[PDB]
Amino acid sequence: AYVTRTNIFYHASSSRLLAVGHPYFSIKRANKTVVPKVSGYQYRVFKVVLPDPNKFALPDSSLFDPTTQRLVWACTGLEVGRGQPLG
Amino acid sequence: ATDAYVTRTNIFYHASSSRLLAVGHPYFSIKRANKTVVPKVSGYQYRVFKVVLPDPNKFALPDSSLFDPTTQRLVWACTGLEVGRGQPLGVGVSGHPFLNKYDDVENSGSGGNPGQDNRVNVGMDYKQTQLCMVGCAPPLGEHWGKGKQCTNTPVQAGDCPPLELITSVIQDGDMVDTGFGAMNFADLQTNKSDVPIDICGTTCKYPDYLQMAADPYGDRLFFFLRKEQMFARHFFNRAGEVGEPVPDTLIIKGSGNRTSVGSSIYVNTPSGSLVSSEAQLFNKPYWLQKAQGHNNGICWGNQLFVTVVDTTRSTNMTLCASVTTSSTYTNSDYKEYMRHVEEYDLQFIFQLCSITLSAEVMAYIHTMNPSVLEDWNFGLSPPPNGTLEDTYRYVQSQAITCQKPTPEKEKPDPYKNLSFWEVNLKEKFSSELDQYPLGRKFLLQSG
Amino acid sequence: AEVMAYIHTMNPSVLEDWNFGLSPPPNGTLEDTYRYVQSQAITCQKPTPEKEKPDPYKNLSFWEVNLKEKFSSELDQYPLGRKFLLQSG
Amino acid sequence: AYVTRTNIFYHASSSRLLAVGHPYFSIKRANKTVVPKVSGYQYRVFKVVLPDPNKFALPDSSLFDPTTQRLVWACTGLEVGRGQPLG
């Protein structure tokens, strides 16, 4: 209705995240916590950041004009990697 | 990525074995004072099957009016697969004669303090499992292990060591998870008495796919299936002194006999469920026409790994044997041994592919793995210094007698430490599959 | 690929970092992304032990400061190269 | 030749850096320092890192095939600045 889509896409992905701790409460020493309250019963809030599109090279894209046009990344593919043995 | 290199023939074959040497005791090993008599054989292990193939360029091909030897090379390509699953359909439940236990925390009422060795004779079943692994590279297994600590506080007895993933290639006989994690079960569970026997003295692992899916080789990934089911039966505990106690801030203290701290350690009772005829993937041919990997069935090295885990055929058979019948009925009359028998068989349909030879063609194979070109005949390297002396050992020994010291440096297998099952299947080929059931339905498919 | 040996022999320290994805002209990649370790709890098992390290004088001290991601495509709003735009034309 | 030359030129950089230190000697507590020995008669060497030029560039770049075009930055000029009283 208002935007035209870029012909050319990308990929990125992470490779791992781990989180190990104790379910019932946080392991708290007299100073601070070294091991926090971690279990699978917890909500899992994850924020991802993403680069501003001006510092990247493209095969054939001199047509758009930065005095008049604008580009932004867009979410198209999504996938959540889970590989723990179940239980 | 292989299909851009290689073209296609229209020639097919088949091989298959008979059965397997798979009988023995589920939980541990029968040995004499020298060596293991009867091997520890249960159904709950990873089942690694190695086969070898005959090389087709080394094989006498009767058709040579199509393609020349020095122009192109030939390697078999994998299309069809089948496994032999024909045991009785069953399930064994096992455990430990001394398992640490307070009481049932599922019901109400019971709580006390433990004294001497409350480890008792419990036996509980497991989860479901159905999977199938194929590859010209072996799969890599995944489990955990205790972490080393930085030296700022000295380690006391009863501390909190961290954890660390250990990734290693699986052997036949390695232990699959039954709902208790994957770690060094022999070392980390320091009592050797908090889990059942069959997972006591070993380690346990679980296979991850995504890290193998992360590597774009695909020499250890062709096509796999996954059917695993579980739910919980009961709620139980463990017998011992609680290591880390509850913070009394987030709770409320009681009085009398209720001052004391009961169990904070609570143990799941894992359970199996109903199994069907229909949920089995097995006895069913599949077609790797295009797969999720770069390798289009071109199993390198004339070699192929096979691993399948299933416990739907998994009951022990009891047995008794009379020593005497002196009275009418007593209990010192019989000996009871535990044996378990399993079978497998392996059935495949392969294709042949003609691969050309070029410098850019030989580039990728030189860097993907050196052993295939080490096996291949393209090394020049002009024939060096054979001019030197070949001479007689003799006797009346000049002083070097018995000079047969260097036959070695042949050894192309680093996996000699790795112990898993093997199949020699070179001698079993035939051109037309019509005398065989399994590719016949592919010939029913094709026309 | 002929001058790719010239940059290989420029220094082997270059193409061990300037891989980029294309080696001497076999032209393959490493692709070992299973090794990515994460954590949150303090395990102290950070990669500070010895491995193959480019620029091995990291044991020797210096002063390096990051300036990378700050770039500008528009330059005449900066005073520097507009003088050079007066210079170069 | 082996290199060629493009058309477009760039710069941006940050401003300032405080450096504080004792002229004669250094100060360390029994296992830590708070402030280093920074002094005018030292070899002030300063080092920079730069973004990757091949994949990460201007998006109005239409020139290159991915198969054989490697892209590098080229240095043109610099300017240092010394804004203290001279003593």
Tell me the C-alpha distance between B224 and D7, whole Å: 52
Give chain A's end-to-end CA distance (angstroms, integer). 47
Tell me the C-alpha distance between B377 and B119, whole Å: 63
- The nearest CA of chain A is from the CA of B208 a distance in Å of 6
Helix (H) or strand (E) holding B164: strand B163-169
Exposure on the CB side of residue B398, measured as CA atoms within 13 A = 6
CA distances from B80 to B20, B109, B344, B438, C88 (A): 21, 59, 17, 9, 69
Helix (H) or strand (E) holding C81: helix C79-88
**Residue B66: both structure tokens together:** 């199509």
Tell me the C-alpha distance between B26 and B341, whole Å: 9
Is chain B in touch with chain D: ≥3 Cβ pairs within 8 A? no
| Binary contact (D55, A54; C-beta < 8 A) | no
What's chain D's length in residues?
Answer: 87
Tell me the C-alpha distance between B245 and B248, whole Å: 9
In one letter, which amino acid is B150?
C
**Cis amide bond preceding B381, omega within 30:** yes
CB A33 within 8 A of CB B247: no
| Binary contact (A59, D60; C-beta < 8 A) | no
Q: Give the experimental resolution in Å.
A: 4.2
Sign, CA torsion B252/B255/B259/B263: negative
Strand partners of residue B166: B143
Tell me the C-alpha distance between B291 and B298, whole Å: 12
Query: Of all residues in chain B, what percent are helix, strand and coil, respectively (each to 5)?
Result: 10, 25, 65
Tell me the C-alpha distance between B182 and A83, whole Å: 13
| Binary contact (B214, C43; C-beta < 8 A) | no
- Selection from B340, B368, B355, B348 nearest residue B305 by Cα: B348
User: Where in A32-75 does DSSP place strands (E)?
Assistant: 33-35
Tell me the C-alpha distance between B95 and C11, whole Å: 63
CB A27 within 8 A of CB A34: yes
DSSP state of A84: P
| Binary contact (C31, B215; C-beta < 8 A) | yes
State the structure-solving technique.
Answer: cryo-EM
| Residue whose entry in the numeric block shows the structure tokens 């054979």 | B386
- The nearest CA of chain C is from the CA of A29 a distance in Å of 13
Three-state secondary structure call for residue C88:
helix
Phi, psi (deg, nearest 5) at residue B314: -130, 45
Chain C hits for A20, Cβ within 8 Å: 39-41
Tell me the C-alpha distance between B178 and B190, whole Å: 19
Q: Please enumerate in sequence order all residues whose Cβ is within 8 A of that of B427, keeping only pairs 6 or more positions apart, or say none.
A: none
Burial (CB count within 10 angstroms: exposed 0-12, middle 13-18, buried 19+), residue D74? exposed
User: Where in chain C does DSSP place strands (E)?
Assistant: 64-66
Tell me the C-alpha distance between B76 and B56, whole Å: 7
| Binary contact (A57, D57; C-beta < 8 A) | yes
In one letter, which amino acid is B328?
T
Chain D hits for A64, Cβ within 8 Å: 59-60
| Binary contact (A83, B182; C-beta < 8 A) | no
The shortest CB-CB distance from C26 to any of B149, B217, B367 is to B367
Tell me the C-alpha distance between B292 and B225, whole Å: 12
Chain D hits for A63, Cβ within 8 Å: 62
CB D10 within 8 A of CB C76: no
| Binary contact (C32, B215; C-beta < 8 A) | yes
Touching C (3+ Cβ pairs <8 A), the chains are A, B, D
The shortest CB-CB distance from B163 to any of A20, A28, A85 is to A20
The shortest CB-CB distance from C72 to any of D10, D44, D77 is to D10
Chain A hits for B244, Cβ within 8 Å: 27
Tell me the C-alpha distance between A37 and A24, whole Å: 6
Tell me the C-alpha distance between B349 and B236, whole Å: 50
Exposure on the CB side of residue B60, measured as CA atoms within 13 A = 2
CA distances from B220 to B78, B373, D76 (A): 13, 19, 50
Residue of C nearest to A37 (CA): C41
Contacting B with CB below 8 Å, chain C residues are 25-28, 31-34, 37, 41, 43-45
CB B428 within 8 A of CB B15: yes
Tell me the C-alpha distance between B28 and B19, whole Å: 23
CB B230 within 8 A of CB B179: yes
